[PDB]
């Protein structure tokens, strides 16, 4: 597998029609997963499944600018399970990131960071065994 935390370079940033696919397996008794699409030190799109926030499972999405987190967008639809293999697909579309998990649409996150071609790294972290991380233009 891959070593977690894992950094995937995104050469020349992202662009609509770029599809990023993450394959892995959630560890037993997982607490968190995170994808961090970064523009330098900023996080354009943080995607953060939390397995136990006040005994609830929730996905928290946000943006970090100049070391400040913005307004959280929360999704209670939670397709992950401790112990199970998953596929996360993040498709960049003109106005938003579109996320599907295990081939089912999960959420969209509107672009707050506008310079898409400067979002040049994806950090993958958390309680997973990471199998692959890649991208393709569709
Ligand atoms: O916003 C994403 C960001 O959240 C931090 O945790 C927040 C928490 O969600 C919020 O409810 C509380 O009031 O403040 C915390 C600190 O900002 C995470 O620590 C961070 O890793 C991101 O996930």
Short mmCIF file of N, CA, C and O and ligand atoms in Angstrom, two decimals:
data_model
loop_
_atom_site.label_atom_id
_atom_site.label_comp_id
_atom_site.label_asym_id
_atom_site.label_seq_id
_atom_site.Cartn_x
_atom_site.Cartn_y
_atom_site.Cartn_z
N UNK A 1 0.80 -1.22 0.00
CA UNK A 1 0.00 0.00 0.00
C UNK A 1 0.84 1.29 0.00
O UNK A 1 2.05 1.26 -0.26
N UNK A 2 0.18 2.41 0.27
CA UNK A 2 0.84 3.71 0.37
C UNK A 2 1.00 4.13 1.82
O UNK A 2 0.20 3.74 2.68
N UNK A 3 2.00 4.94 2.12
CA UNK A 3 2.20 5.44 3.47
C UNK A 3 1.29 6.63 3.74
O UNK A 3 1.24 7.58 2.95
N UNK A 4 0.57 6.57 4.87
CA UNK A 4 -0.33 7.62 5.32
C UNK A 4 0.32 8.37 6.48
O UNK A 4 0.85 7.73 7.39
N UNK A 5 0.30 9.71 6.47
CA UNK A 5 -0.27 10.62 5.47
C UNK A 5 0.48 10.60 4.15
O UNK A 5 1.70 10.44 4.11
N UNK A 6 -0.28 10.75 3.08
CA UNK A 6 0.22 10.63 1.73
C UNK A 6 0.01 11.94 1.00
O UNK A 6 -1.06 12.54 1.09
N UNK A 7 1.02 12.38 0.26
CA UNK A 7 0.89 13.57 -0.57
C UNK A 7 0.85 13.21 -2.05
O UNK A 7 1.79 12.59 -2.58
N UNK A 8 -0.22 13.61 -2.71
CA UNK A 8 -0.36 13.41 -4.14
C UNK A 8 -0.19 14.75 -4.85
O UNK A 8 -1.05 15.63 -4.72
N UNK A 9 0.90 14.94 -5.61
CA UNK A 9 1.04 16.18 -6.38
C UNK A 9 -0.04 16.26 -7.43
O UNK A 9 -0.39 15.25 -8.04
N UNK A 10 -0.56 17.46 -7.63
CA UNK A 10 -1.53 17.72 -8.68
C UNK A 10 -0.89 18.73 -9.63
O UNK A 10 -0.97 19.93 -9.40
N UNK A 11 -0.22 18.24 -10.69
CA UNK A 11 0.62 19.15 -11.49
C UNK A 11 -0.18 20.23 -12.21
O UNK A 11 -1.07 19.94 -12.99
N UNK A 12 0.16 21.49 -11.94
CA UNK A 12 -0.59 22.58 -12.52
C UNK A 12 -1.96 22.74 -11.90
O UNK A 12 -2.85 23.33 -12.50
N UNK A 13 -2.14 22.20 -10.70
CA UNK A 13 -3.38 22.39 -9.97
C UNK A 13 -4.50 21.54 -10.52
O UNK A 13 -4.27 20.57 -11.27
N UNK A 14 -5.73 21.92 -10.17
CA UNK A 14 -6.88 21.20 -10.66
C UNK A 14 -7.61 22.06 -11.68
O UNK A 14 -7.28 23.23 -11.89
N UNK A 15 -8.60 21.46 -12.32
CA UNK A 15 -9.28 22.06 -13.46
C UNK A 15 -10.57 21.28 -13.65
O UNK A 15 -10.60 20.08 -13.34
N UNK A 16 -11.64 21.91 -14.13
CA UNK A 16 -12.81 21.07 -14.39
C UNK A 16 -12.47 19.91 -15.33
O UNK A 16 -11.61 20.04 -16.21
N UNK A 17 -13.13 18.77 -15.07
CA UNK A 17 -12.97 17.47 -15.75
C UNK A 17 -11.83 16.63 -15.17
O UNK A 17 -11.61 15.50 -15.62
N UNK A 18 -11.14 17.14 -14.16
CA UNK A 18 -10.16 16.33 -13.46
C UNK A 18 -10.85 15.50 -12.38
O UNK A 18 -11.58 16.03 -11.52
N UNK A 19 -10.61 14.19 -12.44
CA UNK A 19 -11.21 13.22 -11.52
C UNK A 19 -10.12 12.62 -10.66
O UNK A 19 -9.17 12.03 -11.18
N UNK A 20 -10.24 12.77 -9.35
CA UNK A 20 -9.28 12.21 -8.43
C UNK A 20 -9.93 11.02 -7.73
O UNK A 20 -11.05 11.13 -7.22
N UNK A 21 -9.25 9.88 -7.74
CA UNK A 21 -9.78 8.65 -7.17
C UNK A 21 -8.87 8.14 -6.06
O UNK A 21 -7.67 7.93 -6.26
N UNK A 22 -9.47 7.93 -4.88
CA UNK A 22 -8.76 7.42 -3.72
C UNK A 22 -9.36 6.08 -3.33
O UNK A 22 -10.58 5.99 -3.09
N UNK A 23 -8.54 5.03 -3.30
CA UNK A 23 -8.97 3.70 -2.88
C UNK A 23 -8.27 3.33 -1.59
O UNK A 23 -7.05 3.46 -1.49
N UNK A 24 -9.03 2.84 -0.62
CA UNK A 24 -8.42 2.37 0.60
C UNK A 24 -9.40 1.54 1.40
O UNK A 24 -10.48 1.19 0.92
N UNK A 25 -9.00 1.21 2.62
CA UNK A 25 -9.83 0.47 3.56
C UNK A 25 -9.77 1.19 4.89
O UNK A 25 -8.70 1.58 5.34
N UNK A 26 -10.93 1.43 5.50
CA UNK A 26 -10.97 2.08 6.79
C UNK A 26 -10.47 1.11 7.85
O UNK A 26 -10.85 -0.07 7.84
N UNK A 27 -9.62 1.58 8.74
CA UNK A 27 -9.15 0.77 9.86
C UNK A 27 -10.29 0.41 10.80
O UNK A 27 -11.33 1.07 10.80
N UNK A 28 -10.11 -0.65 11.61
CA UNK A 28 -11.11 -0.93 12.65
C UNK A 28 -11.13 0.21 13.67
O UNK A 28 -10.09 0.80 13.94
N UNK A 29 -12.31 0.51 14.22
CA UNK A 29 -12.44 1.57 15.22
C UNK A 29 -11.84 2.90 14.77
O UNK A 29 -11.16 3.59 15.54
N UNK A 30 -12.09 3.25 13.52
CA UNK A 30 -11.56 4.50 12.98
C UNK A 30 -12.16 5.70 13.68
O UNK A 30 -13.29 5.65 14.15
N UNK A 31 -11.39 6.78 13.73
CA UNK A 31 -11.88 8.04 14.26
C UNK A 31 -12.10 9.09 13.17
O UNK A 31 -13.07 9.83 13.22
N UNK A 32 -11.19 9.16 12.20
CA UNK A 32 -11.26 10.18 11.17
C UNK A 32 -10.59 9.77 9.86
O UNK A 32 -9.74 8.88 9.82
N UNK A 33 -11.01 10.45 8.80
CA UNK A 33 -10.35 10.44 7.49
C UNK A 33 -10.26 11.90 7.07
O UNK A 33 -11.14 12.69 7.41
N UNK A 34 -9.22 12.29 6.33
CA UNK A 34 -9.18 13.64 5.76
C UNK A 34 -8.53 13.68 4.39
O UNK A 34 -7.48 13.07 4.17
N UNK A 35 -9.18 14.40 3.48
CA UNK A 35 -8.57 14.84 2.24
C UNK A 35 -8.37 16.33 2.35
O UNK A 35 -9.29 17.06 2.72
N UNK A 36 -7.16 16.79 2.04
CA UNK A 36 -6.83 18.20 2.05
C UNK A 36 -6.28 18.62 0.69
O UNK A 36 -5.13 18.36 0.38
N UNK A 37 -7.12 19.25 -0.12
CA UNK A 37 -6.68 19.85 -1.37
C UNK A 37 -6.08 21.20 -1.08
O UNK A 37 -6.81 22.12 -0.67
N UNK A 38 -4.77 21.33 -1.25
CA UNK A 38 -4.06 22.52 -0.80
C UNK A 38 -3.62 23.43 -1.93
O UNK A 38 -3.22 22.98 -2.99
N UNK A 39 -3.70 24.73 -1.66
CA UNK A 39 -3.08 25.77 -2.45
C UNK A 39 -2.00 26.40 -1.57
O UNK A 39 -2.29 27.25 -0.72
N UNK A 40 -0.77 25.92 -1.72
CA UNK A 40 0.26 26.30 -0.77
C UNK A 40 -0.15 25.91 0.64
O UNK A 40 -0.57 24.78 0.88
N UNK A 41 -0.05 26.85 1.58
CA UNK A 41 -0.50 26.60 2.95
C UNK A 41 -2.02 26.63 3.11
O UNK A 41 -2.54 26.17 4.13
N UNK A 42 -2.74 27.18 2.14
CA UNK A 42 -4.19 27.19 2.25
C UNK A 42 -4.79 25.83 1.91
O UNK A 42 -4.20 25.05 1.15
N UNK A 43 -5.94 25.53 2.51
CA UNK A 43 -6.68 24.32 2.15
C UNK A 43 -7.92 24.74 1.39
O UNK A 43 -8.87 25.26 1.98
N UNK A 44 -7.91 24.53 0.08
CA UNK A 44 -9.04 24.89 -0.75
C UNK A 44 -10.27 24.05 -0.42
O UNK A 44 -11.39 24.56 -0.41
N UNK A 45 -10.06 22.77 -0.18
CA UNK A 45 -11.16 21.84 0.10
C UNK A 45 -10.66 20.78 1.05
O UNK A 45 -9.79 19.97 0.71
N UNK A 46 -11.21 20.83 2.26
CA UNK A 46 -10.99 19.88 3.34
C UNK A 46 -12.24 19.02 3.42
O UNK A 46 -13.35 19.55 3.54
N UNK A 47 -12.06 17.70 3.31
CA UNK A 47 -13.15 16.72 3.35
C UNK A 47 -12.83 15.76 4.49
O UNK A 47 -11.84 15.04 4.42
N UNK A 48 -13.64 15.78 5.54
CA UNK A 48 -13.24 15.19 6.81
C UNK A 48 -14.35 14.35 7.45
O UNK A 48 -15.10 14.84 8.30
N UNK A 49 -14.46 13.08 7.05
CA UNK A 49 -15.30 12.14 7.78
C UNK A 49 -14.84 11.96 9.22
O UNK A 49 -13.67 11.66 9.48
N UNK A 50 -15.78 12.16 10.14
CA UNK A 50 -15.57 11.99 11.58
C UNK A 50 -16.48 10.87 12.06
O UNK A 50 -17.69 10.93 11.87
N UNK A 51 -15.89 9.83 12.63
CA UNK A 51 -16.64 8.64 13.02
C UNK A 51 -17.28 8.75 14.41
O UNK A 51 -18.18 7.97 14.75
N UNK A 52 -16.83 9.71 15.21
CA UNK A 52 -17.39 9.89 16.54
C UNK A 52 -17.25 11.34 16.99
O UNK A 52 -16.36 11.68 17.77
N UNK A 53 -18.15 12.18 16.51
CA UNK A 53 -18.27 13.53 17.02
C UNK A 53 -19.53 13.55 17.86
O UNK A 53 -20.63 13.53 17.33
N UNK A 54 -19.36 13.56 19.18
CA UNK A 54 -20.49 13.47 20.10
C UNK A 54 -21.38 12.26 19.79
O UNK A 54 -22.60 12.37 19.80
N UNK A 55 -20.73 11.13 19.50
CA UNK A 55 -21.39 9.86 19.21
C UNK A 55 -22.24 9.88 17.96
O UNK A 55 -23.18 9.09 17.81
N UNK A 56 -21.89 10.79 17.05
CA UNK A 56 -22.49 10.85 15.72
C UNK A 56 -21.39 10.78 14.67
O UNK A 56 -20.24 11.15 14.91
N UNK A 57 -21.75 10.26 13.50
CA UNK A 57 -20.85 10.23 12.35
C UNK A 57 -21.26 11.35 11.40
O UNK A 57 -22.43 11.51 11.09
N UNK A 58 -20.29 12.14 10.97
CA UNK A 58 -20.58 13.31 10.16
C UNK A 58 -19.40 13.59 9.25
O UNK A 58 -18.26 13.28 9.61
N UNK A 59 -19.66 14.15 8.08
CA UNK A 59 -18.58 14.61 7.23
C UNK A 59 -18.54 16.13 7.29
O UNK A 59 -19.55 16.81 7.04
N UNK A 60 -17.38 16.65 7.67
CA UNK A 60 -17.17 18.09 7.76
C UNK A 60 -16.32 18.55 6.59
O UNK A 60 -15.24 18.01 6.37
N UNK A 61 -16.81 19.55 5.85
CA UNK A 61 -16.03 20.15 4.77
C UNK A 61 -15.78 21.63 5.07
O UNK A 61 -16.63 22.32 5.65
N UNK A 62 -14.62 22.13 4.67
CA UNK A 62 -14.26 23.51 4.93
C UNK A 62 -13.08 23.93 4.07
O UNK A 62 -12.53 23.14 3.28
N UNK A 63 -12.71 25.20 4.22
CA UNK A 63 -11.60 25.85 3.56
C UNK A 63 -10.77 26.55 4.62
O UNK A 63 -11.33 27.14 5.55
N UNK A 64 -9.45 26.50 4.49
CA UNK A 64 -8.57 27.21 5.41
C UNK A 64 -7.79 28.26 4.63
O UNK A 64 -7.11 27.92 3.65
N UNK A 65 -7.91 29.52 5.03
CA UNK A 65 -7.25 30.65 4.37
C UNK A 65 -6.42 31.39 5.40
O UNK A 65 -6.95 31.78 6.44
N UNK A 66 -5.14 31.60 5.11
CA UNK A 66 -4.23 32.28 6.03
C UNK A 66 -4.34 31.71 7.45
O UNK A 66 -4.38 32.47 8.43
N UNK A 67 -4.39 30.39 7.53
CA UNK A 67 -4.47 29.64 8.78
C UNK A 67 -5.79 29.81 9.55
O UNK A 67 -5.87 29.49 10.73
N UNK A 68 -6.83 30.28 8.87
CA UNK A 68 -8.15 30.38 9.49
C UNK A 68 -9.18 29.49 8.80
O UNK A 68 -9.39 29.60 7.59
N UNK A 69 -9.83 28.62 9.56
CA UNK A 69 -10.93 27.84 9.02
C UNK A 69 -12.14 28.72 8.79
O UNK A 69 -12.41 29.64 9.58
N UNK A 70 -12.87 28.47 7.72
CA UNK A 70 -14.08 29.21 7.42
C UNK A 70 -15.32 28.53 7.98
O UNK A 70 -15.24 27.80 8.97
N UNK A 71 -16.45 28.77 7.33
CA UNK A 71 -17.72 28.16 7.72
C UNK A 71 -17.78 26.70 7.29
O UNK A 71 -17.59 26.38 6.12
N UNK A 72 -18.05 25.82 8.25
CA UNK A 72 -18.15 24.39 7.95
C UNK A 72 -19.41 24.06 7.18
O UNK A 72 -20.48 24.64 7.43
N UNK A 73 -19.28 23.14 6.23
CA UNK A 73 -20.42 22.52 5.58
C UNK A 73 -20.49 21.07 6.00
O UNK A 73 -19.55 20.31 5.80
N UNK A 74 -21.62 20.68 6.59
CA UNK A 74 -21.72 19.36 7.20
C UNK A 74 -22.69 18.47 6.45
O UNK A 74 -23.74 18.92 5.98
N UNK A 75 -22.32 17.20 6.35
CA UNK A 75 -23.12 16.19 5.69
C UNK A 75 -23.29 15.00 6.61
O UNK A 75 -22.30 14.38 7.00
N UNK A 76 -24.53 14.69 6.98
CA UNK A 76 -24.80 13.56 7.88
C UNK A 76 -24.93 12.23 7.14
O UNK A 76 -24.85 11.17 7.77
N UNK A 77 -25.14 12.27 5.83
CA UNK A 77 -25.03 11.04 5.03
C UNK A 77 -23.59 10.56 5.17
O UNK A 77 -22.65 11.32 4.90
N UNK A 78 -23.41 9.32 5.60
CA UNK A 78 -22.10 8.83 6.00
C UNK A 78 -21.89 7.41 5.48
O UNK A 78 -22.30 6.44 6.11
N UNK A 79 -21.25 7.28 4.30
CA UNK A 79 -21.19 5.98 3.63
C UNK A 79 -20.02 5.09 4.07
O UNK A 79 -19.94 3.96 3.60
N UNK A 80 -19.16 5.59 4.95
CA UNK A 80 -17.98 4.85 5.38
C UNK A 80 -18.33 3.94 6.54
O UNK A 80 -19.26 4.21 7.30
N UNK A 81 -17.57 2.86 6.67
CA UNK A 81 -17.71 1.93 7.79
C UNK A 81 -16.33 1.45 8.21
O UNK A 81 -15.52 1.09 7.35
N UNK A 82 -16.07 1.43 9.51
CA UNK A 82 -14.81 0.89 10.00
C UNK A 82 -14.61 -0.50 9.44
O UNK A 82 -15.55 -1.31 9.38
N UNK A 83 -13.39 -0.78 9.00
CA UNK A 83 -13.06 -2.09 8.49
C UNK A 83 -13.31 -2.31 7.01
O UNK A 83 -12.84 -3.30 6.47
N UNK A 84 -14.03 -1.41 6.34
CA UNK A 84 -14.46 -1.71 4.97
C UNK A 84 -13.70 -0.93 3.90
O UNK A 84 -13.32 0.24 4.09
N UNK A 85 -13.52 -1.56 2.73
CA UNK A 85 -12.91 -0.89 1.57
C UNK A 85 -13.83 0.17 0.99
O UNK A 85 -15.05 -0.02 0.95
N UNK A 86 -13.23 1.27 0.55
CA UNK A 86 -13.97 2.40 0.00
C UNK A 86 -13.28 2.93 -1.24
O UNK A 86 -12.08 2.71 -1.47
N UNK A 87 -14.06 3.65 -2.02
CA UNK A 87 -13.57 4.45 -3.14
C UNK A 87 -14.13 5.85 -3.00
O UNK A 87 -15.34 6.01 -2.89
N UNK A 88 -13.26 6.85 -2.94
CA UNK A 88 -13.69 8.24 -2.98
C UNK A 88 -13.32 8.80 -4.34
O UNK A 88 -12.15 8.72 -4.75
N UNK A 89 -14.30 9.35 -5.05
CA UNK A 89 -14.04 10.05 -6.31
C UNK A 89 -14.40 11.51 -6.15
O UNK A 89 -15.50 11.84 -5.73
N UNK A 90 -13.43 12.38 -6.43
CA UNK A 90 -13.64 13.81 -6.38
C UNK A 90 -13.52 14.32 -7.81
O UNK A 90 -12.44 14.25 -8.41
N UNK A 91 -14.63 14.78 -8.36
CA UNK A 91 -14.65 15.33 -9.71
C UNK A 91 -14.72 16.84 -9.63
O UNK A 91 -15.62 17.39 -9.00
N UNK A 92 -13.76 17.51 -10.25
CA UNK A 92 -13.77 18.96 -10.28
C UNK A 92 -14.74 19.41 -11.36
O UNK A 92 -14.59 19.06 -12.54
N UNK A 93 -15.74 20.18 -10.96
CA UNK A 93 -16.69 20.74 -11.90
C UNK A 93 -16.59 22.27 -11.84
O UNK A 93 -15.96 22.81 -10.92
N UNK A 94 -17.16 22.98 -12.83
CA UNK A 94 -16.89 24.42 -12.92
C UNK A 94 -17.17 25.22 -11.64
O UNK A 94 -16.38 26.14 -11.34
N UNK A 95 -18.21 24.88 -10.87
CA UNK A 95 -18.55 25.66 -9.70
C UNK A 95 -18.30 24.93 -8.38
O UNK A 95 -18.44 25.54 -7.33
N UNK A 96 -17.96 23.64 -8.43
CA UNK A 96 -17.85 22.86 -7.20
C UNK A 96 -16.99 21.62 -7.38
O UNK A 96 -16.77 21.15 -8.51
N UNK A 97 -16.51 21.10 -6.25
CA UNK A 97 -16.03 19.72 -6.18
C UNK A 97 -17.23 18.81 -5.98
O UNK A 97 -18.06 19.07 -5.13
N UNK A 98 -17.31 17.74 -6.77
CA UNK A 98 -18.38 16.76 -6.62
C UNK A 98 -17.80 15.46 -6.08
O UNK A 98 -16.90 14.88 -6.70
N UNK A 99 -18.30 14.99 -4.94
CA UNK A 99 -17.75 13.80 -4.30
C UNK A 99 -18.74 12.64 -4.36
O UNK A 99 -19.89 12.80 -3.98
N UNK A 100 -18.26 11.50 -4.84
CA UNK A 100 -19.01 10.25 -4.80
C UNK A 100 -18.19 9.24 -4.01
O UNK A 100 -16.97 9.18 -4.14
N UNK A 101 -18.87 8.44 -3.20
CA UNK A 101 -18.23 7.37 -2.47
C UNK A 101 -18.86 6.05 -2.88
O UNK A 101 -20.09 5.94 -2.91
N UNK A 102 -18.03 5.08 -3.23
CA UNK A 102 -18.53 3.76 -3.65
C UNK A 102 -19.60 3.90 -4.75
O UNK A 102 -20.64 3.23 -4.71
N UNK A 103 -19.33 4.80 -5.69
CA UNK A 103 -20.16 5.05 -6.87
C UNK A 103 -21.52 5.70 -6.58
O UNK A 103 -22.37 5.77 -7.47
N UNK A 104 -21.71 6.21 -5.37
CA UNK A 104 -22.94 6.93 -5.05
C UNK A 104 -22.61 8.37 -4.71
O UNK A 104 -21.74 8.63 -3.88
N UNK A 105 -23.33 9.29 -5.33
CA UNK A 105 -23.12 10.70 -5.04
C UNK A 105 -23.27 11.00 -3.55
O UNK A 105 -24.22 10.53 -2.90
N UNK A 106 -22.34 11.77 -3.02
CA UNK A 106 -22.35 12.11 -1.61
C UNK A 106 -22.61 13.60 -1.37
O UNK A 106 -23.53 13.95 -0.64
N UNK A 107 -21.79 14.47 -1.94
CA UNK A 107 -21.94 15.89 -1.70
C UNK A 107 -21.23 16.70 -2.77
O UNK A 107 -20.42 16.19 -3.55
N UNK A 108 -21.56 17.99 -2.79
CA UNK A 108 -20.82 18.97 -3.59
C UNK A 108 -20.33 20.07 -2.67
O UNK A 108 -20.96 20.37 -1.65
N UNK A 109 -19.21 20.68 -3.03
CA UNK A 109 -18.61 21.77 -2.26
C UNK A 109 -18.25 22.89 -3.22
O UNK A 109 -17.36 22.74 -4.05
N UNK A 110 -18.96 24.01 -3.11
CA UNK A 110 -18.73 25.13 -4.02
C UNK A 110 -17.32 25.71 -3.88
O UNK A 110 -16.80 25.79 -2.77
N UNK A 111 -16.72 26.10 -4.99
CA UNK A 111 -15.36 26.65 -4.95
C UNK A 111 -15.30 27.96 -4.19
O UNK A 111 -15.97 28.94 -4.56
N UNK A 112 -14.50 27.99 -3.13
CA UNK A 112 -14.19 29.22 -2.41
C UNK A 112 -12.85 29.78 -2.87
O UNK A 112 -12.72 30.98 -3.11
N UNK A 113 -11.86 28.90 -3.01
CA UNK A 113 -10.60 29.23 -3.66
C UNK A 113 -10.84 29.23 -5.17
O UNK A 113 -11.35 28.25 -5.73
N UNK A 114 -10.48 30.33 -5.81
CA UNK A 114 -10.79 30.57 -7.21
C UNK A 114 -9.68 30.15 -8.16
O UNK A 114 -9.92 29.85 -9.32
N UNK A 115 -8.45 30.17 -7.66
CA UNK A 115 -7.29 29.83 -8.47
C UNK A 115 -7.10 28.32 -8.48
O UNK A 115 -6.22 27.77 -7.79
N UNK A 116 -7.96 27.65 -9.24
CA UNK A 116 -7.97 26.19 -9.27
C UNK A 116 -6.61 25.63 -9.68
O UNK A 116 -6.17 24.60 -9.15
N UNK A 117 -5.95 26.31 -10.62
CA UNK A 117 -4.68 25.79 -11.13
C UNK A 117 -3.52 26.01 -10.17
O UNK A 117 -2.37 25.71 -10.51
N UNK A 118 -3.81 26.48 -8.95
CA UNK A 118 -2.80 26.58 -7.89
C UNK A 118 -3.03 25.60 -6.74
O UNK A 118 -2.26 25.56 -5.79
N UNK A 119 -4.10 24.80 -6.85
CA UNK A 119 -4.41 23.77 -5.87
C UNK A 119 -3.62 22.53 -6.27
O UNK A 119 -4.13 21.64 -6.97
N UNK A 120 -2.36 22.48 -5.84
CA UNK A 120 -1.39 21.61 -6.49
C UNK A 120 -0.94 20.43 -5.64
O UNK A 120 -0.02 19.71 -6.03
N UNK A 121 -1.60 20.22 -4.51
CA UNK A 121 -1.31 19.05 -3.69
C UNK A 121 -2.58 18.52 -3.06
O UNK A 121 -3.45 19.29 -2.66
N UNK A 122 -2.68 17.19 -2.96
CA UNK A 122 -3.72 16.55 -2.16
C UNK A 122 -3.08 15.74 -1.05
O UNK A 122 -2.33 14.79 -1.33
N UNK A 123 -3.35 16.10 0.20
CA UNK A 123 -2.93 15.31 1.34
C UNK A 123 -4.04 14.36 1.75
O UNK A 123 -5.21 14.74 1.85
N UNK A 124 -3.68 13.10 1.95
CA UNK A 124 -4.61 12.06 2.38
C UNK A 124 -4.16 11.53 3.72
O UNK A 124 -3.03 11.03 3.85
N UNK A 125 -5.02 11.63 4.73
CA UNK A 125 -4.63 11.24 6.07
C UNK A 125 -5.76 10.57 6.83
O UNK A 125 -6.90 10.53 6.38
N UNK A 126 -5.41 10.04 8.00
CA UNK A 126 -6.41 9.44 8.86
C UNK A 126 -6.30 7.94 9.00
O UNK A 126 -5.30 7.31 8.65
N UNK A 127 -7.38 7.37 9.50
CA UNK A 127 -7.37 5.99 9.97
C UNK A 127 -7.75 5.04 8.85
O UNK A 127 -8.79 4.39 8.89
N UNK A 128 -6.88 4.98 7.84
CA UNK A 128 -7.09 4.15 6.67
C UNK A 128 -5.82 3.42 6.28
O UNK A 128 -4.71 3.85 6.61
N UNK A 129 -6.01 2.31 5.59
CA UNK A 129 -4.96 1.71 4.78
C UNK A 129 -5.19 2.24 3.38
O UNK A 129 -6.26 2.05 2.80
N UNK A 130 -4.21 2.93 2.83
CA UNK A 130 -4.36 3.54 1.53
C UNK A 130 -3.83 2.63 0.43
O UNK A 130 -2.67 2.20 0.46
N UNK A 131 -4.67 2.34 -0.55
CA UNK A 131 -4.33 1.41 -1.62
C UNK A 131 -3.83 2.14 -2.86
O UNK A 131 -2.83 1.74 -3.46
N UNK A 132 -4.51 3.20 -3.26
CA UNK A 132 -4.06 4.01 -4.38
C UNK A 132 -4.67 5.39 -4.34
O UNK A 132 -5.74 5.62 -3.76
N UNK A 133 -3.96 6.31 -4.97
CA UNK A 133 -4.39 7.69 -5.12
C UNK A 133 -3.93 8.17 -6.48
O UNK A 133 -2.73 8.16 -6.78
N UNK A 134 -4.86 8.57 -7.32
CA UNK A 134 -4.49 8.94 -8.68
C UNK A 134 -5.51 9.89 -9.27
O UNK A 134 -6.55 10.17 -8.66
N UNK A 135 -5.23 10.37 -10.47
CA UNK A 135 -6.15 11.25 -11.16
C UNK A 135 -6.19 10.95 -12.64
O UNK A 135 -5.27 10.30 -13.19
N UNK A 136 -7.25 11.40 -13.29
CA UNK A 136 -7.38 11.26 -14.72
C UNK A 136 -8.26 12.39 -15.23
O UNK A 136 -9.11 12.92 -14.51
N UNK A 137 -8.03 12.79 -16.48
CA UNK A 137 -8.87 13.80 -17.10
C UNK A 137 -9.98 13.08 -17.85
O UNK A 137 -9.70 12.22 -18.70
N UNK A 138 -11.23 13.38 -17.52
CA UNK A 138 -12.36 12.74 -18.18
C UNK A 138 -13.14 13.71 -19.06
O UNK A 138 -12.73 14.84 -19.30
O1 LIG B 1 -13.52 23.11 10.04
C1 LIG B 1 -12.70 22.00 9.78
C2 LIG B 1 -11.67 21.90 10.88
O2 LIG B 1 -12.44 21.66 12.11
C3 LIG B 1 -11.59 21.62 13.30
O3 LIG B 1 -12.37 21.30 14.42
C4 LIG B 1 -13.31 22.39 14.79
C5 LIG B 1 -14.61 21.82 15.08
O4 LIG B 1 -15.19 21.18 13.88
C6 LIG B 1 -15.55 22.84 15.58
O5 LIG B 1 -16.82 22.25 15.86
C7 LIG B 1 -15.00 23.51 16.86
O6 LIG B 1 -15.81 24.39 17.36
O7 LIG B 1 -13.66 24.12 16.49
C8 LIG B 1 -12.76 23.07 16.01
C9 LIG B 1 -11.39 23.70 15.72
O8 LIG B 1 -11.52 24.56 14.61
C10 LIG B 1 -10.53 20.56 13.12
O9 LIG B 1 -9.64 20.53 14.26
C11 LIG B 1 -9.78 20.69 11.84
O10 LIG B 1 -8.84 19.57 11.72
C12 LIG B 1 -10.68 20.77 10.66
O11 LIG B 1 -11.42 19.53 10.51
#
